[PDB]
Design a protein around this ligand. Structure first.
Ligand SMILES: *[C@@H]1O[C@H](CO)[C@@H](O[C@@H]2O[C@H](CO)[C@@H](O[C@@H]3O[C@H](CO)[C@@H](O)[C@H](O)[C@@H]3O)[C@H](O)[C@H]2NC(C)=O)[C@H](O)[C@H]1NC(C)=O
Lengths: 96, 49, 48, 48
């Protein structure tokens, strides 16, 4: 896992981090399977292009890759609006 | 407006809703027609077409 | 045929116990706890 | 989920079979309490 710094930035009504990209995985999809883990490294090369696109156009909003395996890798990194089960509420978000 | 597009009369049945079930909210887009954002004439229809 | 007397005894005992239960527990198992404000019976994982 | 490596993570259970009423539960590989893995467990199951 990665622990980001999460500065507070405008054009995003929340706290974002530009050092890497966040990954959303559906709750009923087990992270750490062979399919999901294989997707993570080859998608980890998208962070460089995410940063390049951000630095070329500073006024650019979310950049997301929605995978056919259910993953969603988006930049800049930010905590999800509805985390899985830390509070009583749960999220049903599948990128497909 | 950032509000979702409503359909029909909203009917709820609070006698069958548990306090801890976490019902889904919505996923629909805000698709508002041009003729539904203003008063509609016959000239506006031909302009929109 | 010889089981006729036992059948009569069983029938009479069933009748007597049914009448006793009718006098004792009639209208008693009609109250349960639902969720507050709803009509949903409140139970736990493996409890009927 | 049909394999032990598949039965990992969390999943949804629906109360009274209503798709809008769901709760998260972790999924675990469960062995039956009475089984036939060896002769002792098989004999226990047959005695039951
Ligand atoms: C997913 O993970 C694997 C393993 O962590 C990544 O492969 C690793 O890639 C790095 C850099 O591309 C390799 O480092 C290089 O190692 C060579 C010796 O093999 C060394 O001479 C170089 O100076 C450099 O340190 C690393 O060895 C390599 N690991 C393995 C096991 O092959 C892979 O790149 C990740 N996926 C993506 C898309 O990056």
């Amino acid at each position: 896992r990665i622990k980001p710094v999460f500065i507070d930035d405008a054009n995003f009504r929340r706290q974002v981090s530009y050092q890497h990209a966040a990954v959303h995985i559906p709750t009923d999809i087990y992270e750490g399977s062979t399919i999901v883990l294989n997707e993570l490294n080859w998608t980890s090369a998208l962070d460089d292009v995410f940063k390049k696109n951000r630095e070329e156009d500073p006024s650019l909003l979310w950049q997301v890759f929605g995978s056919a395996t259910g993953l969603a890798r988006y930049y800049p990194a930010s905590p999800w609006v509805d985390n899985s089960r830390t509070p009583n509420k749960i999220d049903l978000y599948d990128v497909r | 407006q950032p509000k979702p597009i409503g359909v029909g009369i909203p009917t709820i049945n609070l006698r069958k809703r548990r306090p801890n079930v976490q019902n889904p909210k919505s996923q629909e887009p805000v698709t508002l027609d041009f003729l539904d954002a203003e008063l509609e004439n016959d000239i506006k229809v031909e302009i929109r077409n | 045929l010889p089981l006729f007397h036992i059948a009569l005894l069983v029938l009479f005992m069933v009748i007597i116990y049914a009448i006793i239960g009718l006098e004792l527990f009639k209208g008693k198992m009609h109250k349960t706890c639902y969720y507050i404000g709803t009509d949903i019976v409140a139970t736990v994982e493996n409890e009927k | 989920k049909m394999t032990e490596e598949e039965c990992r993570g969390y999943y949804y259970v629906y109360k009274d079979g209503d798709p809008t009423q769901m709760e998260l539960r972790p999924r675990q590989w469960i062995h039956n309490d009475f089984h036939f893995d060896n002769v002792l467990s098989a004999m226990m199951s047959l005695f039951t």
